[PDB]
Structure 1
Amino acid sequence: GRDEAGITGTWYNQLGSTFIVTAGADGALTGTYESAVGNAESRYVLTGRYDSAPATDGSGTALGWTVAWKNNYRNAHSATTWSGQYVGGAEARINTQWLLTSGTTEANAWASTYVGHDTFTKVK
């Protein structure tokens, strides 16, 4: 992918969470996520996809990934998906919006899903 090298590595968001990802030539994202907030400790598996042949007109690179909040320490019975774009250059960023869904009863399902936004950088 044009940005395989640009995306692969360690990223940090505004909450101090850590996103460790490898971008595959085939469009795969694989890695681990450590949340600095919520019902989470240590690393969680993530997987996702990215556009491995982005536009050459200065547009960002579309990508997304998922974490299910279960590991050997805790289970928050929830999953977050991040949808966003990678923007390359001196101050590289991944700009995302996310959806966090909990498992709920049918009676609480109206309140199942949080929305928010995270900005990832290669420093801090």
Structure 2
Amino acid sequence: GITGTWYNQLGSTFIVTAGADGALTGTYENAESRYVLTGRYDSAPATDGSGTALGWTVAWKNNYRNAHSATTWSGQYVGGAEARINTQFLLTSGTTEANAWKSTLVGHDTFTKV
């Protein structure tokens, strides 16, 4: 039950649809704040109570702005009434070769159905 609307604590929001083939498509977010998303998930997880692996990408360019960057989220989906997606991310900005060593940030996030 990944298909739907998810929320984090800092006010961001995303709507996804999960395909039977393992595809993930949606938008991350006013129009000025919407971005395309795309990803993949394991459409045949284990039955031993492990979570379902997935990930997705967003570049921070739309018809109105371009921050010259992209983020990837990597983590897992856990069902139940407390259904959540736990992730860790990587955010990279384009840079001159001299400044590449400080081009990527790392962090974590949790999304809920409510």
Q: Same fold (TM over 0.5)?
A: yes
Give aligned-pair identity as a percent: 97
Tell me the secondary structure at the aligned position of residue 72 of structure 2.
Answer: strand
Tell me the CA shift for residue 40 of structure 1. 11
Quote the Cα distance in structure 1 between the aligned partners of 2:95 and 2:103. Answer: 6
CA contact (8 A) 1:40 1:69 kept: no
Tell me the CA shift for residue 41 of structure 1. 4.4
Could you report, residue by residue, the CA deviation over 1:33-76 in whole angstroms, capped at 9, with x for unpaired residues?
A: 11xxxx99411001000000001000000000000000011101
- TM-score if structure 2 supplies the norm length? 0.96
What is the Cα-based RMSD across aligned positions, in Å? 1.7
Quote the Cα distance in structure 2 between the aligned partners of 1:41 and 1:12. Answer: 19
Aligned length: 114
Query: Taking structure 1 as reference, are residues 41 and 98 closer, same or farther at Cα in structure 2, changes over 3 Å only?
Result: farther
Tell me the CA shift for residue 114 of structure 1. 0.6
Gaps of 5+ in 1: 1-5
CA contact (8 A) 1:40 1:74 kept: no
Could you report, residue by residue, the CA deviation over 1:67-114 in whole angstroms, capped at 9, with x for unpaired residues?
A: 000001110100000000000010100000000000111011001101
CA contact (8 A) 1:60 1:86 kept: yes
Gaps of 5+ in 2: none
